Each structure stands twice: as C-alpha cells, then as structure tokens.
C-alpha cells in the first residue's frame, strides 16, 4: 500500500503538530549544596536532600 498523491507540506506540518518537546517544568535545589538537580534524583556532586550520599 502506498500513496496515490504526494501529501503536501501543510499536511506534513499538521502531523508534526504533536512532536514538540516539553522542557522540564522546574529544577529542584539541594538544601545543603545549593545545586540544581532533577527532582528525586541526586545532584551532580552526589547530594540528595542535603546529605552527601555518594562520593564523587
């Protein structure tokens, strides 16, 4: 099965109207190190909820 007519650039854009990405609503701030981080994830320096959970 294949198209009988070439779809338009307009129809291509309409299909892609649901493809846009969503930015992260907001980042969280660690209460001890002050780092920003994804909520419920550890920070880049290894803090979570104010505690040094892992080295490096």
Partner 1 sequence: ARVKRGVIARARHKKILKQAKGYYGARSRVYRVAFQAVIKAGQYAYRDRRQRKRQFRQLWIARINAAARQNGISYSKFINGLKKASVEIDRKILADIAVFDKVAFTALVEKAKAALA
Partner 2 sequence: METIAKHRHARSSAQKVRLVADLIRGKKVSQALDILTYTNKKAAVLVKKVLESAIANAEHNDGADIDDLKVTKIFVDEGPSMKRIMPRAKGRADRILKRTSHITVVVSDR
Q: Which residues bind partner 1 (CB under 8 A)?
A: 8-10
9 binds RNA (CB under 7 A): yes
Smallest gap, in angstroms, from Cβ of residue 22 to partner 2? Answer: 8
Using CA atoms, how far residue 30 sits from 20, 22, 25, 26, 54, in Å, is: 30, 23, 17, 13, 14
Contact 46, 52 (CB under 8 A): yes
The reply to whether 52 sits near partner 2 by the rule CB under 8 A is: no
Residues that bind partner 2 (CB under 8 A): 19-21, 23-24, 27, 36, 38
């Amino acid at each position: 099965a294949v198209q009988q007519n070439k779809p338009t650039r307009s129809k291509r854009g309409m299909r892609r109207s649901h493809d846009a990405l969503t930015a992260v609503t907001s980042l969280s701030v660690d209460k001890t190190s002050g780092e920003k981080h994804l909520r419920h994830h550890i920070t880049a320096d290894g803090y979570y909820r104010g505690r040094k959970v892992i080295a490096k």
